[PDB]
C-alpha cells in the first residue's frame, strides 16, 4: 500500500508532540502537537485506517474533503495539514481552546453562563450548520462534545468538528448512524427513515435545552427507557426546570424537538427566532 500524504518523517521534523491528549476514540486520538518553525498549538487527530477489518482510508478522504469544503466558514475548525503513515493519516486541525461545549451543560458551571451566553452560542451554532446545509452536508453527530470553544475565559467562539458522519442529504440510513450514544439520537433514525438536514436540526434543540437547563433531555434509567423517550419526544418543561428559563428560549426548544422532522424549521428560519433577535 502507498501513501498519499505528506511522509511522517515530515512531520516529525516540522511538529512537536505533547502528553496532552485531547481526545481518544476506538480508532482515532487528538493529540495536541506545536509547529517547530512557529511555536502554534495545534489539535493532531490520528486516523487508523483499518477499523474491524474494513479499509477506511476512502471514509477518511471524506471527512477531508468536507473539511476543506467548508475551510471559509469560521464556525467550522481548520484543516491545516495532512500527514499519512503505514496505519494512519494524521489532520492538523485549527487548535480549539476552549474545550467542549459538554463543559457548559454540566452543572458545576451553569454559574458562568448566561441566557445571553447561550443565545450567542446557539447563533454561532446555526450559523455554521447553516452552511454546512447550503452545501448539502448533514452532519449528523452534533452533540456537544462535537462543538468545541476556541476559549473559555472569556467565551469564545464555536468550532464544529468531527464530520466522520457527514452525508449529502438523502442518503441512507446504515449502522454507523443508529448506533452513537442513543440519548443524541433522532426519532427518524430509530424509524430508519433517510437523512435529512432537519436530523442537525434536532440536536441543535438537545444543545439549547442542555445549556439551559443543564441536564439531558432524553436519557433514561437505561437504553430502552432513553429510546422511549425520544420516539415518544417525552422531554421535561416543567416549572422546576424552567424556572429560570425564559419563554422565548423554551419556545425555541420546543420548535425544534418535534418527532416529524418535516415540521422541525431549516437553520436559516432558526436564525429569525424572536430569541436569538437580541440586540448585543
Ligand atoms: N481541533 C481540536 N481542538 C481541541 N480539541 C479537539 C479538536 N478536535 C477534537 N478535539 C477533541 O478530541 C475529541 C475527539 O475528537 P473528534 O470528535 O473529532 O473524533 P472522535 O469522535 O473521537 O472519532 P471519529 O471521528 O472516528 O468518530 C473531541 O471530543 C474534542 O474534545
Ligand atoms: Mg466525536
Redesign the pocket.
Given at each position: 500500500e502507498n501513501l498519499y500524504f505528506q511522509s511522517m518523517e515530515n512531520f516529525n521534523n516540522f511538529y512537536i508532540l505533547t502528553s496532552k491528549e485531547?481526545?481518544?476514540?476506538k480508532?482515532?486520538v487528538?493529540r495536541q502537537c506545536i509547529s517547530k518553525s512557529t511555536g502554534q498549538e495545534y489539535?493532531a487527530?490520528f486516523?487508523k485506517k483499518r477499523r474491524r477489518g474494513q479499509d477506511c482510508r476512502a471514509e477518511i478522504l471524506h471527512?477531508i474533503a468536507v473539511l476543506e469544503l467548508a475551510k471559509s466558514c469560521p464556525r467550522v475548525?481548520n484543516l491545516h495539514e495532512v500527514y499519512e503513515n503505514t496505519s494512519e493519516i494524521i489532520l492538523i486541525?485549527?487548535?480549539?481552546?476552549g474545550?467542549?461545549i459538554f463543559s457548559l451543560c454540566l452543572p458545576e458551571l451553569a454559574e458562568m453562563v448566561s441566557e445571553n451566553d447561550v443565545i450567542r452560542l446557539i447563533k454561532q451554532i446555526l450559523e455554521g450548520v447553516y452552511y454546512l446545509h447550503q452545501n448539502n452536508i448533514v452532519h449528523l453527530?452534533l452533540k456537544p462534545?462535537?462543538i468545541?470553544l476556541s476559549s473559555i475565559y472569556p467565551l469564545g467562539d464555536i468550532?464544529i468538528?468531527?464530520?466522520?458522519?457527514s452525508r449529502k442529504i438523502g442518503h441512507a440510513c446504515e449502522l454507523r448512524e443508529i448506533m452513537g450514544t442513543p440519548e443524541y439520537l433522532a426519532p427518524e433514525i430509530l424509524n430508519y427513515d433517510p437523512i435529512t438536514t432537519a436530523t442537525d436540526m434536532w440536536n441543535i434543540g438537545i444543545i439549547a435545552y442542555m445549556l439551559l437547563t443543564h441536564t439531558s433531555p432524553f436519557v433514561g434509567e437505561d437504553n430502552q427507557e432513553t429510546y422511549l423517550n425520544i420516539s415518544q419526544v417525552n422531554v421535561d418543561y416543567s416549572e422546576e426546570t424552567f424556572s429560570s428559563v425564559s419563554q422565548l428560549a423554551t419556545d425555541f426548544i420546543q420548535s425544534l424537538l418535534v418527532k416529524n422532522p418535516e415540521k422541525r424549521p431549516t437553520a436559516e428560519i432558526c436564525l429569525s427566532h424572536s430569541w436569538l433577535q437580541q440586540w448585543d
Open positions: 485531547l481526545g481518544r476514540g480508532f482515532a487528538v489539535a487527530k486516523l471527512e475548525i486541525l485549527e487548535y480549539a481552546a474545550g467542549e453527530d462534545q462535537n468545541l468550532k468538528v468531527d464530520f466522520g458522519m
